């Protein structure tokens, strides 16, 4: 099919393809056949695995949180006791997927979530309880749960999923951005104010995901850890940028740590060392 | 040469005229009609008194003062003692009907006031006692006198805070129901044509009120300097496409 290199022989002309001027801002498509004698070879390659659809198309962990099943008697702040918990939806908490997404400026896609819940009984327990988890999506404007047993968990309009601990939850969500694409970066503010926040933290008000355990308490305490995975599908990306070099310090902002190790390796020897 | 302002309505041997109306409303854009075979269930051949019951009946005038809260009537209840229509209501097991409601209120170009005139289908009232108290039959069957929203509560009766529509919803959204306003500076009358609205082809006309009519002052009444601080409000209702079914002995109702 496609040729990787054409057959090219000796050369002696005034057409010098290897002499350019990089200050123009262009990367002239020079080939090996332009500076050496080559033979014919074929690609036998389409580059399907480097398509943005494939690059962002696999599940990556985007959040880990914890909730627990125990007696709620006396507990004043259920949220703090972790009788139920929150997740202010965002994809820049765990760095692996974040660096990939931030290889672009604007990004548009549907999301496929997979939520894994694992039980743990650190203290004395006679058996492993069979708990059912309820993950409810709380869009901005919806009433937030205050107690693991609010009226809010009725979830009449909020979408929510019920699944066994140890099992996995799965569903997809359409592209919910308010604009035509999501912003990986935002050089702006919410309004013209002297103190207001800067960055995409201003655009990322996606709401929360409330997690709880439907079962009443058992004699012992059970610790359920929840892991949320995200896979993008039907991907579109715009304006590629320089890859993240320094470590992250916060969700949403480009801030980097003070006093960080150099990122570029230093030669063990000369600039002439191999 | 014609205008929404001037109108005539003739039903039976009764005719009302108005020279200061604001069009007229036909609930959900549907004119009343008789019950078609395809929708019928009751096998009894119905009775259609026509002109003897489909005519205008005028209720006692209410008095709008600077402190009125509003009034609420219920149909067919409000006409239970009105000529042959009323008689048919009690002598039959079933019946259905539509109406033409005409609320009247005139003042001068110096007065100011704005009445909301609305028709609410299935207006299930609430008990002022809260909890799970019911509202006794008598209190939702006031007859032509209707319910006065500025009167005090009474044991077994409904709550009457104009603000919560007697049912736990806000006054301001009453406009989602077929309505009209009588704004003294524009209006003189309000007219609403009501088609039969129910989840059954025909029903009991005594144990169930299909709609309630409310006349609520929104912008309070104000009269010119030194004038009588009140205006009368009159309600005239005419049934239409009335059908009665299952005739038997006369019904006896609570009190």
């Amino acid at each position: 099919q496609t040729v990787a290199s054409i057959s090219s022989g000796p050369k002696h002309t005034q057409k010098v393809p290897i002499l350019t001027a990089n200050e123009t801002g262009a990367t002239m498509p020079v080939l090996p056949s332009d500076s050496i004698e080559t033979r014919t070879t074929y690609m036998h390659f389409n580059g399907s695995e480097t398509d943005v659809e494939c690059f962002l198309g696999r599940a990556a962990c985007v959040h880990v949180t914890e909730i627990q099943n125990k007696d709620a008697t006396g507990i004043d702040n259920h949220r703090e006791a972790k009788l139920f918990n929150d997740w202010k939806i965002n994809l820049s908490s765990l760095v692996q997927l974040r660096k990939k997404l931030e290889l672009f400026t604007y990004v548009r896609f549907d999301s496929e979530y997979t939520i894994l819940a694992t039980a743990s009984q650190p203290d004395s327990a006679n058996y492993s309880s069979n708990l059912v988890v309820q993950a409810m999506y709380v869009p901005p404007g919806a009433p937030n749960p205050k107690e693991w047993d609010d009226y809010t968990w009725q979830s009449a309009s909020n979408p929510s999923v019920f699944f066994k601990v140890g099992d996995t939850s799965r569903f997809s969500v359409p592209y919910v951005g308010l604009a035509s694409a999501y912003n990986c970066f935002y050089d702006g503010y919410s309004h013209d104010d002297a103190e207001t926040q800067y960055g995409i933290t201003v655009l990322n008000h996606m709401g929360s995901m409330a997690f709880r355990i439907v079962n009443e308490h058992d004699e012992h305490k059970t610790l359920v850890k929840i892991r949320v995975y995200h896979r993008a599908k039907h991907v579109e990306a715009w304006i590629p940028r320089a890859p993240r070099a320094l470590p992250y310090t916060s969700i949403g902002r480009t801030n980097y740590p003070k006093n960080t190790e150099p990122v570029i390796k230093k030669r063990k020897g000369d600039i002439k060392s191999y | 040469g014609y205008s929404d302002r001037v109108q005539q309505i003739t039903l039976g041997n009764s005719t009302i005229t108005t020279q200061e109306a604001a069009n007229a409303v036909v609930c959900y854009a549907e004119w009343p009609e008789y019950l078609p075979d395809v929708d019928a269930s009751d096998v009894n051949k119905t009775s259609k008194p026509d002109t003897s019951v489909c005519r205008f009946y005028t209720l006692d005038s209410k008095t709008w003062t600077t402190g009125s809260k509003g009034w609420c009537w219920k149909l067919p209840d409000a006409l239970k003692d009105m000529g042959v229509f009323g008689q048919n209501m009690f002598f039959h097991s079933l019946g259905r009907s539509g109406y033409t409601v005409h609320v009247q209120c005139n003042a001068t170009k110096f007065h100011s006031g704005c009445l909301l005139v609305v028709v609410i289908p299935e207006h299930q009232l609430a008990s002022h006692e809260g909890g799970n108290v019911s509202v006794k039959y008598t209190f939702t069957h006031p007859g032509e006198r209707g319910i006065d929203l500025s009167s005090a509560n009474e044991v077994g009766g409904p709550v009457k805070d104009v603000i919560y529509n007697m049912n736990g919803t806000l006054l301001g959204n009453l406009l989602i129901f077929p309505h009209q306003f009588i704004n003294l500076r524009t209006n003189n009358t309000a007219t609403i044509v009501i088609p039969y609205i129910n989840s059954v082809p025909i029903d009991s006309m005594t144990r169930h009120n299909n709609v309630s009519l409310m006349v609520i002052p929104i912008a309070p009444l104000t009269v010119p300097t030194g004038a009588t601080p009140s205006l009368p409000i009159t309600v005239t209702i005419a049934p239409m496409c009335t059908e009665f079914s299952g005739i038997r002995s006369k019904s006896i109702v609570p009190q």
Binding site: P140, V161, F163, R170, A179 | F110, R185, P201, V223
Partner: protein, 231 residues
């Protein structure tokens, strides 16, 4: 037996899924449909009907007066009322529009705001309604207001003025939940000339304000409302 592989998610109960399920009452014959007027197919149908706005929500408790906007005689260029345009909160929160809007996360489109004069027929007045698109503060005087979208209303035979609040935004959708980035701007009303009453007239004059959506309107991402609870 057909070889299968169960995928993650198996067994889950997604309150939003839409699948088939066996009928617990096989062969049951439901009651025939009969005609019932007033059928509703889409919530976007009903939010186009306007309802009263409790603009004057300055009272100690809820009351009919909350819907009455006071207008004063012989006042000139002064402000009549003002409000931001977070339709999912403030004065709008209890209105049919606000109530329905709160059942969704996103909104877009144009709003229909109208005012109906109730003062005596022999009185006169000229007011000016103004919409101030996001980016600047709510106008502090008529001049400031008049510089943006506005309507000069002449009270007369036709009792109601209808000022549309044209969809003015960069991002094509705003949040129903009050959010700064997606703020909609401000709405204000002022005296263009003044309110004039006729002889023998001293009573207070009021305005009734309504809010509804234009066919322009759109709502997305259904969610629970903060307008009800128990537990």
């Amino acid at each position: 037996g057909l070889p299968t592989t169960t995928l993650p998610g198996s067994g889950q109960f997604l309150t939003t899924d839409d699948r088939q399920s066996p009928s617990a009452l096989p062969n049951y014959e439901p009651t025939p449909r009969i005609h019932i007027p007033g059928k509703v197919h889409n919530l976007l149908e009903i939010i186009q009907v306007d309802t009263l706005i409790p603009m004057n929500n300055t009272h100690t408790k809820d009351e009919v007066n909350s819907y009455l906007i006071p207008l004063n005689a012989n006042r000139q260029n002064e402000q009549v009322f003002g409000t931001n345009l977070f339709i999912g909160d403030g004065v709008f929160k209890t209105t049919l529009l606000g109530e329905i809007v709160q059942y969704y996360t996103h909104w877009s489109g144009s709003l229909r705001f109208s005012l109906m004069y109730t003062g005596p027929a022999l009185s006169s007045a000229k007011l000016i309604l103004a919409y101030t698109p996001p980016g600047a503060r709510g106008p502090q005087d008529r001049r400031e207001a008049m510089l943006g979208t506005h309507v000069v209303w002449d009270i007369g035979l036709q009792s109601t003025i209808v000022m549309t609040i044209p969809w003015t935004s960069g991002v094509q959708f705003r949040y129903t939940d009050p959010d700064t980035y997606t703020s909609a701007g401000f709405l204000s009303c002022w005296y263009q000339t003044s309110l004039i009453l006729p002889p023998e007239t001293t009573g207070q004059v009021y305005l009734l304000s309504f809010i509804s959506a234009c066919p322009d309107f759109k709502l997305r991402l259904m969610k629970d409302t903060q307008t009800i609870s128990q537990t």
